[PDB]
Structures are given as C-alpha cells and as structure tokens.
C-alpha cells in the first residue's frame, strides 16, 4: 500500500512487547555502547563530599525485534519512535 513509513511504524510496534529484552536467542546478551560528555561542573560540596555535574549521555544498543528490510518500505533507513514505547536498559550510576 501507500501510507508510507506509517506502515513501518505499525509493522514493528504491532505486537512488540516492551517488557521482554529484544533478543531472538535469550542466551545472547544485549550490548549497550555508552558515551559521556562533560558539559559543566555545577557544584562541588567539600563538606558533604558530593559532586554535582551535568552530562550529555548517549546510549546505543541492538533491538533484535525492531529489524526490517529497507525495501518494500520505500527504502526507509531509520525511524523515530517514542522512547517509552520500546525496551530500555536500566544502566545507572553507583555514586
């Protein structure tokens, strides 16, 4: 048909359960490549011994369920979809 990329949006997210980790083989681990950029050191607290900073953070991973072929989708490469509509890693900071 011809609604274009909207089709894609359906096709991927139709039965997609965002609770299960996106791997066809459960034994296969999902690798998250991360990136940290220091924007500013906001404040150091010498008394309470606590540092407050601002970071630009980048997360890259592989969603094995959200894969498709560019063809028969009008040669679409990438698609912008809501963050909270897909599985997301729970990476945090210990400090």
């Amino acid at each position, epitope marked *: 048909t011809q609604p274009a990329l909207l089709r894609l949006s359906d096709h991927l997210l139709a039965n997609y359960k965002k609770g299960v980790r996106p791997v066809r083989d459960w034994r296969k681990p999902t690798t998250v*490549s991360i990136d940290v950029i220091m924007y500013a050191i906001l404040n150091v607290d010498e008394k309470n011994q606590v540092l407050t900073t601002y970071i630009w953070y980048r997360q*890259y991973w*592989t969603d094995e369920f959200l894969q498709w072929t560019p063809e028969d989708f009008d040669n679409v*490469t*990438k698609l912008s979809i809501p963050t909270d509509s897909i599985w997301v890693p729970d990476i945090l900071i210990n400090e």
Partner: nanobody
Amino acid sequence: DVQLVESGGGLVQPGGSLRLSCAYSGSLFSILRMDWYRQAPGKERELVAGITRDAAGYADSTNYADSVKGRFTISRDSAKNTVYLQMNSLKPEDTAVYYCNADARTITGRADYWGQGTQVTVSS
C-alpha cells in the same frame, strides 16, 4: 557496514572536466572523514582529496594533495547522501581508477570503508 558506490567516471579529452560522485548508504553510521583515492595501473594508491567538519561544528574543511591542488574540488551533499569530486583541466596523468574511502563509525566501531571505484581515462 556502510556501502560506498562511485559513479560519474568516463572518457574525457585533456583539459576537460568531469564530476565524480560517491554515494554512502547503510543503517546506523557516522562518516567522520571521506577521502578520495586514485590508483593508476601499476602505480600505488594516491590520496586526492578529503573533507571533514572543522573545529567549529558548522563549516567543513577540505584537504587536497599538491598534485590536484588547483584543479580538483571536493564537496558534499548530506541531503543527497553523496560526496562529490569536481575535476577540472584533466591531465593524461590523472587517468586512473578512483575509489572513495569513508572513515565511519557504526555500532560495531570506527572503521574504514571502500567503494568499487570508477574508471577515469583521459586520452586524445
């Protein structure tokens, strides 16, 4: 894995002009640097032109070899996903196979990618 496709190569008389196009494609990639290479029969690989964004994150910065210093002009179109090489006053010594080398970063990591290259023959 980003794929590169060269095009525009052909036969031209000396002193003529020819425009080469290199089209990149893939899934998730970031072209950090794009170089043009040429290889004459028997001769080594020669660096022709390159392009990379400046320290200021707006205007680009080109890099030319002493050989093609004045004749060649490398440009790009992010919208058309294609990097161009404008060859003016082609010499018979400029005759070679022109590849394009893209230093790109993917989910796998930072790596170099090469195209199939196009034949550029300058003869009378």
